[PDB]
Amino acid sequence: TPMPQFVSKDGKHALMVDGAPFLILGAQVNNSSNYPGIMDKVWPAMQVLGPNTVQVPIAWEQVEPEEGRFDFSFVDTLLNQAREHKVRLVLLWFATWKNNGPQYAPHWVKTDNQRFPRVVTREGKSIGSLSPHAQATLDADRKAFVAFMQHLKKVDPQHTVIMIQPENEAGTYGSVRDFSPMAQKLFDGQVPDELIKRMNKQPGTWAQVFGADADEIFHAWSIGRYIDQIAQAGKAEYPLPMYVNAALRGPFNPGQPGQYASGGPTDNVLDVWKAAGPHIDLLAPDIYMPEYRMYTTVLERYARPDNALFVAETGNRPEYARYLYPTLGHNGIGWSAFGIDYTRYSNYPLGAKHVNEETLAPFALGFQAVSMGMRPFAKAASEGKLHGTAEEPGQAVQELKLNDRWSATITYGVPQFWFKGEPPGNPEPIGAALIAELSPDEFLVTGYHARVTLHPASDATANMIYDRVEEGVYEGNDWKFQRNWNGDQTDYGVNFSSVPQLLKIKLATYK
């Protein structure tokens, strides 16, 4: 039975799970929800949200508490629980970097600054981030990761785990790079030929080749090479797809490297990370920018022909929920919300002050609607045929171009009937829509707090007819019909409110 795998060719991408494209509808537990005694506050929240994939930390300190003495008992417990609760897993390897720092490395690592040295600032101060240049730290992380991947292969032939995230938001706060002598000797050397080629530059030293950006590009390359070697060695044991996640710099008015985590896969060093990381399948943004223009711009920059869009983390405040459909609209591999458990922790002001059934309901709506047709939606994404949009404040109408024949008007905050006047939008921005092209004249359509009005895009389709507007669900790939919408229910577009409904709409023209 085929194991999970990431494919990408000519800018079309698929996460293949059980032999077909898959879309991650993800939930990530909080950072300290990775022990047997706390899982009873994880699963009741997942039951409410209904993700198809759960992200859980696997901490280096817990799997190798003493060097050479491995303990994967929590991985085993977690696989049983995920199988019982019918979710797939994405495991997060909290090791050399977690939010730039060594806090999840074991005692014998993070207390030993001699064997495992920290970044040194230009002024000579050690700071809370391990240097990518130390061979001992790479060796020890990679050895632990290799034991981890070997264990996974032995106990997960069911393929419950579909991806691995090596490290978590690697990079450095408080310095653009390491300035230790160890670092300076490498920085003074020649830029590796692989990076010279990919960057369209002439050979030379780091300062010669990259100028004012040499410090930041050097640090990104060195972190990338570090994680790539870990990815390559772990894949040699069990070749699950692997991705790294990015602490973002501001898309419009970024600060200086070091204010944001320098060296991480920020939007200015994506080609460096690509060159450095051939064994890393994608670079995934962690988006905690709730403002529409910022969020959607991050989506556009990380969705590249060489980079499948996966939103590995985003906020759990309700205004975030609507960003699922525009993410899927970039035809990547999915979207995950962060902080989904009942441990009473809150990452406000990034996310919600409390996680409960009310705060989860806007997310569960989208997860239920996509799950009603997940495999066809994922087939569409893998062919580049998924369209998605979310409501922007002060803009009550959007236009989606679908193909030569049809377009869709998206209108927010209107009745499900004729109305007089300009569309007002919803009082808060909460609407969204998602449209899959199955064939030129047939679409899968869902939305919430929104009207979707399909209309001709050319003179050939001016004589538009609703042939069928079928409500139903999919069982795997088999369509289960419930009813044909007609009359009032199609006279004013098709109108969605607060319940999950999937429509398979076949259009015709009269002749």
Added chain:
Amino acid sequence: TPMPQFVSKDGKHALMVDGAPFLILGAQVNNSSNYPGIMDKVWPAMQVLGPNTVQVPIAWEQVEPEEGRFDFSFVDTLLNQAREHKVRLVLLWFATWKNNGPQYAPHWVKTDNQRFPRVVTREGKSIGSLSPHAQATLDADRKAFVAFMQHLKKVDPQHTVIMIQPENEAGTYGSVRDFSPMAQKLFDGQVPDELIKRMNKQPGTWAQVFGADADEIFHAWSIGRYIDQIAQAGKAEYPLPMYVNAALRGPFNPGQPGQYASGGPTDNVLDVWKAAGPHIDLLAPDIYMPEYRMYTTVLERYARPDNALFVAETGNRPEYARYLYPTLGHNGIGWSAFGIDYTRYSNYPLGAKHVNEETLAPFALGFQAVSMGMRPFAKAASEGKLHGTAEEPGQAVQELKLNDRWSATITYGVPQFWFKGEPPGNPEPIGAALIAELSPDEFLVTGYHARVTLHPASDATANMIYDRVEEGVYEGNDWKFQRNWNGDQTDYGVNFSSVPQLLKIKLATYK
């Protein structure tokens, strides 16, 4: 066992069901609630509202999806469900016209503008309404309707179905008539002698005879003849009563024909429709005019000596509920509310934003009260002896003339006791009353949010005595006594609030 039948003589009317007059307390599901997979969101709402009759679409596209290949399986399912849930059915034939358009005609009809042509505007544009002049469209609709009536006769000897509505709001938006050559050849001809007689006019062409109104009267006659031939052929197979429903034009400031649906049974062409439709039992208004003066004027215009009043549709917003009793007061055959299911569709702003137990309670109150004496109420209506009224904003008192001996004062928003000052009315208009004359000195009385004070109408009855004020219910026609109201409960009229109560009041005089 006698089948349902409509009788009318000298301006008195009855819908005979199971051998006696019947009054429809109706509920209509939304337009796309006509498939097996959605009926579990219909019946729980009917359980709350408690109609005695449910209206459900029977779509041409679903019973003849391919020409000649009939499928009445949903009709069969629906008859079983109506029998289990103890309601009668009125079936709506969604075919050549539904809200003026062909959207419920099958694929092989509504995509074939050659065989089944659309109305052509004066400027040459085909628009979304099938021409009444095409023989193929009439033939195909009638053939489907005949198969439908034949099936009904075979599977409904219980007579669950009591009426059929051929077509739904036939007429045309965007043109006063068809201007195609096919239409013009008929328009240029002589007005049929049947219409010339009924309209008190001299023979001639359509333009000669009817002048400025020729276009609209021609279209109404041609639609009427179309549906009448379908009614006649269907009745030849199974002679259930049949009615058509009207999309109204404004009673006071109507627009132009084509702004409102031209050719439908609007209030200016009722004699045309009568002349054209001898096999159509009545013309029924669909009233979505919530303002008192408009609603009640529509009632008066459609209640004619040659037209039994049936309100086939009205709004499901709570202010509409009170219009049941004035409708029954015209001594027709009943009243039905539109959009009664839990599918989460809303036709706001015509109706309510949500359908739930709260929004249905004002309707259920009236349906429960009338059902407590439905057969005697319907016997009264068939003798012209039913009186009914609803509260008008800014008018806290109304006077009902009952007969030579007695009248009833209706007072809104007062205590059930002595009060000082002018009656204030209810804060919102919600009151109503219904009074049946059983014999000169005995009345059935119910109401809500209202006081009913019977008082002498002549010097012969000045010495008024409450002989009996019996609360109870009817089992069929047998009166079941609960108690005699007296004392406080009759000193200030008889006072109704929010619970269904039927009173049988016998008056006397002391001597």
Added chain:
Amino acid sequence: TPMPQFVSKDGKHALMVDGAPFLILGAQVNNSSNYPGIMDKVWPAMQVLGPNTVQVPIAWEQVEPEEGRFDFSFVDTLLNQAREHKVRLVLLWFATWKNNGPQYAPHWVKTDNQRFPRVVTREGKSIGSLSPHAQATLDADRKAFVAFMQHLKKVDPQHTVIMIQPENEAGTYGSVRDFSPMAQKLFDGQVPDELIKRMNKQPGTWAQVFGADADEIFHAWSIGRYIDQIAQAGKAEYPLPMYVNAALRGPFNPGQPGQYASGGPTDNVLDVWKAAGPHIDLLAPDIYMPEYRMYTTVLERYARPDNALFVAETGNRPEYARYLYPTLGHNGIGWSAFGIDYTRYSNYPLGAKHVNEETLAPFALGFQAVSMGMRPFAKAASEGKLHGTAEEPGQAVQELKLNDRWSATITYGVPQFWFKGEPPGNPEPIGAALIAELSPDEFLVTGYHARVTLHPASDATANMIYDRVEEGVYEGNDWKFQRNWNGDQTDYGVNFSSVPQLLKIKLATYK
């Protein structure tokens, strides 16, 4: 086993029930709650209120619907239900007068103005009140009442029924007396010697003897003689205690006789009614005057050495509940609230807009507290040893004189602890207290929303000691101890809130 009986000597009174004094904690159903089919809306309300005595109409129209054809089946049903629900009964004979009118007399009475004539005004108009002067009406009422009392004796040896109320608010609206010739012949005659004696006047005609008040005194005497003869004949069959109830005239600014019900036992003709009614045990006020000064003045006027105070009716709005204890403080026989059922009738503005568990809770509190010591409370009342008071708006302190040794300060709206400043009173007037003197130094004390502070009334008791402050209840006459209040619970008086608590307080002095 002794039957119920009213005793009164030297201004001390007792309703003896089962051989000992009894205090009525009464509830009266609404006027049309006197049929088997409505009793399921009576008993659930009594379960909440918990009266010890229920008042129910027994209508002449229902027990003699045709002359000579008696039907006491409802009396039988009602006795079974009262025994099952553990209440005593007071039966109300709705006959010649109910609120001045004949509406509860049978068909063959109230429609026959010839045999049973109405009062004639000075101008010659018959009005809605039967003349006390017609021998046929007296004969027919008395005959029905005699059949009623005979039936009671046969089917009620349990003595469920403890009193009878002949007629209901007898009197006349719209005329001071009857002016018919039948009436004038009697009015022109001599004042009966019995009334001449009791009124301390010299013999003469009605106009000579009574002057400007002759009309009103004549009507009161004639109604009184009418009901007295009915009482005497009914008592000859079964000598239950009997009382009449009064529709009050204003205590301070009364209107004219005829505006209020002339001839009823109003506060100006109590000596007339005493003289006329030796077989009527007491004259009971019906108090719907919610203002403190009016309510308590009515109490004082009807509590006479020759008249035991029984409040036969009062309002069911919550502000009325507190008037129970000052009524008991006049050492009569009890107090009853009117309109206690769930039939959805309201006599607002006299009483509450709705009867439910919230509106009944302030009454149930008092009924529960008195029931916790009802027989000792009733023994105290029969010895004149009960003291009671209710809160007056704007007066947060009252002083009750108990005996030579002790007094009680009643304070409203204070904490159950030390407080600074003037007592504020409760926000609405809701407090009350009730104190029985068991012996010179021992008292039964209860209250609600109030503090009771016992304190010395003389120099002999200056050295006051709380010997015992026992919370408990009585079983019949046997005291069941729960706890001794001390400390905080007695440092600031004894403080009552919203739960029923009976305290048996023994005082001492240190020496």
Added chain:
Amino acid sequence: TPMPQFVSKDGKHALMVDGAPFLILGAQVNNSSNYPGIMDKVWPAMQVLGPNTVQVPIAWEQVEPEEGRFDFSFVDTLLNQAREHKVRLVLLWFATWKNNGPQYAPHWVKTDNQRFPRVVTREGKSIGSLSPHAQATLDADRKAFVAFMQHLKKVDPQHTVIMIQPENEAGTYGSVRDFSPMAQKLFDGQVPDELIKRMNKQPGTWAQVFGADADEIFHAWSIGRYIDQIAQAGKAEYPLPMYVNAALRGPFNPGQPGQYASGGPTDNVLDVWKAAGPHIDLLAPDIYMPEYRMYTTVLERYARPDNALFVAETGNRPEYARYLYPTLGHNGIGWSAFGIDYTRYSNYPLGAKHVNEETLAPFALGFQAVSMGMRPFAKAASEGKLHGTAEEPGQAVQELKLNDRWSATITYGVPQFWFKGEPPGNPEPIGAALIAELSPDEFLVTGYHARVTLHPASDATANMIYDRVEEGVYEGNDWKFQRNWNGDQTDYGVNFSSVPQLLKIKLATYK
């Protein structure tokens, strides 16, 4: 099995219960909740609050109602109930003084001012407080207390009762001392040599030695000697630890002795009470001063090297709950809240208007958190290693000095994440924290509505590492691990909200 015992040496103290230090998390029932018939309104409240120790009055009037006739049946019942409900008991001997007065002494005491004389004012008036100088009153109280201690020893080998409180707030209101001749003869004599030594003064009379404070110091010494002799005699029978409780005088602006209870253990006569009371283990404040500066100053004054801090009573209004942790921070023996039952009594304005699950929740939070590590917390207190603090209005940050190596910053009203700007504090003051030093680099930490940020206190610990931040609970002394907090949960201190959580935090430094 060792019985409870109080140990104190060189300013470190422990209440030894079952052989190890113990911390009282106490609840006291109201003053009249000391009878079998009211205990069903005590235990349901204790179930909600969850104290480990309940204080209950044992009244002299109830155990010796007649002289020589002892009745300890309630003590027996109460021991059974405390064992069933799993709490320890502290019994309060309500005898010669309760809130200065004799109200709980038996009838034959408090009514006999001859045998048991009251304090006489300077003007000759007897007032409500028994004189400490009468030998009969001492003899009779001591005899009753000796019978009580003998009974306890016989029926409590389980050691359910851990301390006894002889008398309750002894002292006098309305006079600084007794001025009777009996008192004056003693006052005129020489100051006992024991008091002369302890007060660092020269021999002489009371007026010579103490001057303006002679009256108050004389009264405190005489009350102290009275209770000490009772303590000594009771301990001779069963040597349970014993304490007296104090009605406080204002810490900053005290009134005159007699306005506050003169002679009680107020903050100016603590050395007198120590000298007079060698058999009294500690002097405990009763703190009903809700203002932060007053409450915490009282704590400081009563926590002395010769006086273990026990807060025997405090308010049950929610603002009081947070004072538990600063009390424990003085390394005494515990803290108890007053008025914890459902009898519907309120000592507002000292405490809450109602006791229910809402008003108890802020207290239950602290009791649950301390109970999760009660024995280690009590071991820490006995070594002087407990630190505790509560939030002060207008101060959102506090600093706790722990040892040479570490300190803790306490921040109130902040998110559990990074925030911009000055800490706002909670809207009402509700935060607190409690920190036990287990060893130099390991701490037990709990709090609520607060952030605790451990940080270096010296250059030696500048390179701080969170080695482990373990959430769990203790079973007795055995630690039960749940999870290791890391990541978000430790990046911004450790953050507590509204649920009980105990963290065992081991700190390291990197090298």
